[PDB]
Design an enzyme around this catalytic site. Structure first.
Site, short mmCIF file in Angstrom:
data_model
loop_
_atom_site.label_atom_id
_atom_site.label_comp_id
_atom_site.label_asym_id
_atom_site.label_seq_id
_atom_site.Cartn_x
_atom_site.Cartn_y
_atom_site.Cartn_z
N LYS A 1 11.78 -6.22 3.86
CA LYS A 1 11.80 -5.56 2.55
C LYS A 1 12.80 -6.27 1.67
CE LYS A 1 11.16 -1.11 2.34
NZ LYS A 1 11.40 0.34 2.44
N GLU B 1 -8.95 3.90 6.31
CA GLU B 1 -7.50 4.14 6.42
C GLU B 1 -7.04 3.55 7.75
OE1 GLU B 1 -6.81 4.96 3.63
OE2 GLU B 1 -8.07 6.65 2.90
N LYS C 1 -15.03 2.85 -5.37
CA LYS C 1 -13.77 3.61 -5.42
C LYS C 1 -12.98 3.06 -6.61
CE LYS C 1 -15.23 4.62 -1.14
NZ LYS C 1 -16.60 4.29 -0.68
N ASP D 1 8.93 2.30 12.47
CA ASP D 1 8.51 3.15 11.33
C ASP D 1 6.99 3.22 11.30
OD1 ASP D 1 8.65 4.61 8.87
OD2 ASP D 1 8.57 2.72 7.73
N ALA D 2 6.42 4.41 11.40
CA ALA D 2 4.96 4.60 11.32
C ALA D 2 4.49 4.10 9.97
CB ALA D 2 4.58 6.04 11.52
N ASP E 1 3.55 -0.28 6.72
CA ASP E 1 2.61 0.19 5.67
C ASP E 1 1.74 -0.99 5.22
OD1 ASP E 1 3.49 2.90 5.57
OD2 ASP E 1 5.01 2.39 4.04
N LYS E 2 2.34 -2.16 5.04
CA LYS E 2 1.58 -3.35 4.59
C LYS E 2 0.66 -3.85 5.71
CE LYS E 2 1.60 -4.13 0.33
NZ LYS E 2 0.15 -3.90 0.42
N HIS F 1 5.73 -5.43 7.35
CA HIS F 1 6.12 -4.05 7.01
C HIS F 1 4.98 -3.15 7.48
CE1 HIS F 1 6.61 -0.34 4.87
NE2 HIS F 1 7.91 -0.62 4.88
N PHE G 1 18.56 -4.91 12.78
CA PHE G 1 17.13 -4.70 12.50
C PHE G 1 16.35 -5.49 13.55
CE2 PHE G 1 14.05 -4.81 8.53
CZ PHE G 1 13.03 -4.24 9.27
N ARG H 1 0.57 3.31 1.15
CA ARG H 1 1.95 3.86 1.03
C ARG H 1 2.87 2.83 0.38
NH1 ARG H 1 3.58 8.49 4.22
NH2 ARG H 1 5.65 7.51 4.07
N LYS H 2 2.30 1.77 -0.20
CA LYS H 2 3.06 0.75 -0.96
C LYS H 2 2.38 0.52 -2.32
CE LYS H 2 6.68 0.22 1.51
NZ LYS H 2 6.48 1.66 1.77
N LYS I 1 -11.02 0.00 0.47
CA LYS I 1 -11.99 0.66 -0.44
C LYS I 1 -12.89 -0.38 -1.11
CE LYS I 1 -8.66 4.35 -1.49
NZ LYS I 1 -8.03 5.04 -2.62
N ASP J 1 -10.26 3.92 -7.82
CA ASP J 1 -8.82 3.71 -7.54
C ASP J 1 -8.51 2.22 -7.53
OD1 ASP J 1 -7.92 6.32 -7.21
OD2 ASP J 1 -8.27 6.30 -5.02
N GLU K 1 -14.36 6.48 6.54
CA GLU K 1 -15.81 6.60 6.32
C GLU K 1 -16.35 5.23 5.92
OE1 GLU K 1 -13.62 8.48 4.15
OE2 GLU K 1 -13.28 9.81 5.89
C1 LIG Z 1 14.15 2.54 7.04
S1 LIG Z 1 12.51 2.67 7.74
C2 LIG Z 1 12.04 4.33 7.11
C3 LIG Z 1 12.77 5.46 7.76
C4 LIG Z 1 12.32 5.64 9.21
N1 LIG Z 1 10.92 6.21 9.29
C5 LIG Z 1 13.29 6.56 9.96
O1 LIG Z 1 12.87 7.08 11.02
O2 LIG Z 1 14.44 6.76 9.55
C6 LIG Z 1 11.50 1.99 6.42
C7 LIG Z 1 11.29 0.52 6.49
O3 LIG Z 1 12.58 -0.14 6.51
C8 LIG Z 1 12.51 -1.24 7.38
N2 LIG Z 1 13.41 -1.04 8.51
C9 LIG Z 1 13.12 -0.61 9.78
N3 LIG Z 1 14.15 -0.63 10.58
C10 LIG Z 1 15.18 -1.12 9.80
C11 LIG Z 1 16.53 -1.40 10.09
N4 LIG Z 1 17.07 -1.23 11.29
N5 LIG Z 1 17.28 -1.93 9.10
C12 LIG Z 1 16.71 -2.11 7.90
N6 LIG Z 1 15.46 -1.87 7.51
C13 LIG Z 1 14.73 -1.39 8.52
C14 LIG Z 1 11.05 -1.42 7.78
O4 LIG Z 1 10.42 -2.26 6.85
C15 LIG Z 1 10.56 0.03 7.73
O5 LIG Z 1 9.16 0.11 7.54
C1 LIG Z 2 -14.52 11.36 -3.14
S1 LIG Z 2 -13.58 11.50 -1.63
C2 LIG Z 2 -12.96 9.78 -1.49
C3 LIG Z 2 -14.01 8.77 -1.14
C4 LIG Z 2 -14.47 8.94 0.30
N1 LIG Z 2 -13.41 8.50 1.28
C5 LIG Z 2 -15.75 8.15 0.54
O1 LIG Z 2 -16.05 7.90 1.73
O2 LIG Z 2 -16.48 7.78 -0.40
C6 LIG Z 2 -11.96 11.94 -2.24
C7 LIG Z 2 -11.72 13.41 -2.39
O3 LIG Z 2 -12.74 13.96 -3.25
C8 LIG Z 2 -13.11 15.23 -2.76
N2 LIG Z 2 -14.50 15.22 -2.34
C9 LIG Z 2 -15.02 15.09 -1.07
N3 LIG Z 2 -16.32 15.22 -1.02
C10 LIG Z 2 -16.68 15.46 -2.34
C11 LIG Z 2 -17.93 15.69 -2.93
N4 LIG Z 2 -19.07 15.76 -2.25
N5 LIG Z 2 -17.94 15.94 -4.26
C12 LIG Z 2 -16.78 15.89 -4.93
N6 LIG Z 2 -15.55 15.67 -4.48
C13 LIG Z 2 -15.57 15.47 -3.15
C14 LIG Z 2 -12.13 15.59 -1.65
O4 LIG Z 2 -11.03 16.24 -2.22
C15 LIG Z 2 -11.80 14.21 -1.10
O5 LIG Z 2 -10.55 14.18 -0.43
NA NA Z 3 6.73 5.97 8.13
NA NA Z 4 -9.30 8.77 2.70
#
Ligand SMILES: C[S@@+](CC[C@H](N)C(=O)[O-])C[C@H]1O[C@@H](n2cnc3c(N)ncnc32)[C@H](O)[C@@H]1O
Ligand SMILES: C[S@@+](CC[C@H](N)C(=O)[O-])C[C@H]1O[C@@H](n2cnc3c(N)ncnc32)[C@H](O)[C@@H]1O
Ligand code: NA
Ligand code: NA
Ligand SMILES: CC(C)n1ncc2c(C(=O)Nc3ccc4[nH]ncc4c3)cc(C3CC3)nc21
Ligand SMILES: CC(C)n1ncc2c(C(=O)Nc3ccc4[nH]ncc4c3)cc(C3CC3)nc21
Ligand SMILES: [Cl-]
Ligand SMILES: [Cl-]
EC number: 2.5.1.6
Lengths: 382, 382
Positions: free
Chosen positions: A168, A44, A276, A245-246, A18-19, A16, A237, A251-252, A272, A278, A57
């Site tokens: 999926k 990311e 972090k 699909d980007a 995103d995965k 997938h 499919f 995103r999961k 992360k 999160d 970063e």
């Molecule tokens: C349906 S696509 C999301 C929508 C897509 N970005 C679009 O342009 O419509 C989301 C996920 O569904 C799965 N997918 C992709 N193509 C598919 C298809 N033809 N049939 C079913 N699932 C599909 C993949 O896992 C994909 O990441």
């Molecule tokens: C803390 S940063 C996430 C961690 C970061 N990617 C890293 O490299 O550690 C997450 C969000 O916090 C905010 N942020 C960025 N720089 C910050 C700073 N110096 N102090 C506090 N919040 C900050 C921004 O909104 C940013 O998108």
């Molecule tokens: Na997408």
């Molecule tokens: Na980020």
């Protein structure tokens, strides 16, 4: 029937898009941690046709070959040929990585005692546990994950060689309300969508998904003549993975956690390091919730924590036991406060969060498997 | 005190790099819908130092100038100079957009009656409403959003000209448990972090954030001598926006919804046309939940729905009323089934989801403001 309700969870396979991004982000994190246990990583990943982009970063003493790390992760997933829509050998790997913001570094960890390191960000995080399975996870999400794992197994062992890595699944369970706990009754609906080759016909795939995937995963006691099956419901499919699909890291996040059960604070896990919260605080909150259930203090529990960037101690801790404890939520909160230290610089020690085991978390959920440190319950004193 | 608990929600400002991506994704969606109401849009945005990347799938009759649309969105947010870390005039705009997968198109909408169009994906979605505010939103998330809106207002009107667009806020409320409903008592903790210029000192910023932001937003009745303030807790936030932290579309899904209250199915909203049930069904589920509360059938309610790609009708509908109705969850489910049609091709008509109003949703939450169609309760027959 009275006191019953439906709940649906989904999961996705390793391919997938995103995965893919989660797994690549965590492959990069592990590569850094293997050389520099104190690497600051916020990696990311973005995937589209022919492209892995790393954006974020990293401040690390590690020397990491991003081309090798990314391509090896995509190879593992199984995207090894243009016929499958993506190839680790020939895709574009783009890197937009810079050092961690010095402003963040100075506010979070520079010249700080490790135990007293600030949360790497503000945010809220939840931990959940439910006695409905031995691993203290919702049955809906466990079955959804196992259906994707079964597809990958049958792809990798060559018994369904028409399978591609992008999949999926979705499982709807009918539950009985039981004194604040939930008792699974039956599987109401299963969805499976999986990428496939241009040779296999829809009837062959639907028959195989029922007989060789669903029957190999879902106990027969949950399946009956009313169970609804949506197998390859799109009808075709062939185009899949990043080409279909980007994909993006994080995103999961509901697939990664409880399949919609419990609650979520919004933070992504993959890419992360432990600073972090999160990730580290969500792992610790799972550990707390699982400790309360396995300690016999409740059948079902939700833990909320929250943080401010640069502040070690959580700003808030909350316990919701769904009415499944003889102890008040106040009494459980006191037990948690007496037994846990949820500063990120203590969580790192308790859960060994400098260890490069993160790629193993980035598919099939972060919770309920493999006895990761956050899955080994703490013996509670009270 | 007995029967009380803490709950924390966060929000982010328009210049938060994840929120920049949401706003750009929705600026692109609106640009398409202005020319082609039936545009198929799946536009992911990635932001890092000097870069907006668009990645995803668009099939549309529209002629869209991506350079103009992206740069105008960044201008609106306020990133207009290298001194602020990002400039709409001089940033890189990269485009990796392809047509929608024909395999998806054929499975979802090709040769389908609009009312009978398939869900654009599988997934689960939740709607939530709570009587604790007139707009039926949790106080925690409302206050968190209003704190970011206040920062943007004071930046834009020049009263705090040291402010930059990137901000985050977090609000912890102490709640009373009230017969399944929740009664806010007091604000326990506020966090505000906001990007700033290299001239203003920390004491000036902390004084202004308390007197000109918090006091202008949070009623004094919720603030007392015990309220904890974490204002610029990192100590320095000059580096911000995409330069401080890589942003992605759909990484603020809890900020976008209920601030951790209710539940979330994992789907991102921004950059997606109505056929993507991640957005349309979440909007419809909010509309159902708000209709049940405003109809006086419950004080607090959660609605789950789920879909299979290519299938019009939801696979599952579930109602959880937290014990705040005289009617059973079964009776509320029957009322919802009698009053709502949650096929995406009917939701589009009811909520006018071809209208290019999506950029207006992409900051300060999608729910609880501006009487969007999903915020106007349906009169229920039962
Ligand atoms: C349906 S696509 C999301 C929508 C897509 N970005 C679009 O342009 O419509 C989301 C996920 O569904 C799965 N997918 C992709 N193509 C598919 C298809 N033809 N049939 C079913 N699932 C599909 C993949 O896992 C994909 O990441
Ligand atoms: C803390 S940063 C996430 C961690 C970061 N990617 C890293 O490299 O550690 C997450 C969000 O916090 C905010 N942020 C960025 N720089 C910050 C700073 N110096 N102090 C506090 N919040 C900050 C921004 O909104 C940013 O998108
Ligand atoms: Na997408
Ligand atoms: Na980020
Ligand atoms: C917030 C979401 C993830 N969340 N969290 C709990 C539930 C329940 C739930 O537990 N219901 C229930 C009600 C009464 C009862 N008595 N004893 C047991 C029991 C159980 C249901 C739903 C449906 C999907 C909306 N969501 C829930
Ligand atoms: C699943 C998450 C988002 N979620 N959903 C409800 C709650 C509550 C909650 O409503 N508690 C409560 C308990 C008993 C009661 N009687 N009357 C009223 C009432 C209220 C609390 C927490 C804390 C953060 C863990 N999360 C909740
Ligand atoms: Cl598994
Ligand atoms: Cl607002």
């Amino acid at each position: 029937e009275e006191g019953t309700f439906l709940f649906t969870s989904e999961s996705v396979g390793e391919g997938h898009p995103d995965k893919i991004c989660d797994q690549i982000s965590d492959a990069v994190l592990d590569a850094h941690l293997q050389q520099d246990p104190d690497a600051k990583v916020a990696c990311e990943t973005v995937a589209k046709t022919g492209m892995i982009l790393l954006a974020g970063e990293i401040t690390s003493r590690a020397a990491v070959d991003y081309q090798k790390v990314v391509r090896e992760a995509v190879k593992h997933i199984g995207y090894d040929d243009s016929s499958k829509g993506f190839d680790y050998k020939t895709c574009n790997v783009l890197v937009a990585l810079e050092q961690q913001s010095p402003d963040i570094a100075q506010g979070v960890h520079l010249d700080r005692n490790e135990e007293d390191i600030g949360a790497g960000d503000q945010g809220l995080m939840f931990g959940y546990a439910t006695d409905e399975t031995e691993e203290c996870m919702p049955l809906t999400i466990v079955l959804a994950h196992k259906l994707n794992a079964k597809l990958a197994e049958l792809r990798r062992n060559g018994t369904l060689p028409w399978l591609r890595p992008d999949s999926k699944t979705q499982v709807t369970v009918q539950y009985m309300q039981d004194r604040g706990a939930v008792l699974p009754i039956r599987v109401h609906t299963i969805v499976i969508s999986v990428q496939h080759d241009e040779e296999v016909c829809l009837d062959e795939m639907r028959d195989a998904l029922k007989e060789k995937v669903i029957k190999a995963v879902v106990p027969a006691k949950y399946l009956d003549e009313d169970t609804i099956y949506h197998l390859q419901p799109s009808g075709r499919f062939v185009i899949g993975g990043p080409q279909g699909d980007a994909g993006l890291t994080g995103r999961k996040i509901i697939v990664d956690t409880y399949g919609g059960w419990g609650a979520h604070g919004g933070g992504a896990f993959s890419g992360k390091d432990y600073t972090k919260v999160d990730r580290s605080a969500a792992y610790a909150a799972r550990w707390v919730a699982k400790s309360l259930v396995k300690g016999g203090l409740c059948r079902r529990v939700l833990v909320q924590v929250s943080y401010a960037i640069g502040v070690s101690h959580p700003l808030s801790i909350s316990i919701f036991h769904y009415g499944t404890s003889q102890k008040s939520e106040r009494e459980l909160l006191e037990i948690v406060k007496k037994n846990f230290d949820l500063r990120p610089g203590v969580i790192v020690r308790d859960l060994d969060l400098k260890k490069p085991i993160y790629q193993r978390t980035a598919a099939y959920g972060h919770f309920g498997r493999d006895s990761f440190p956050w899955e080994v319950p703490k013996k509670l004193k009270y």
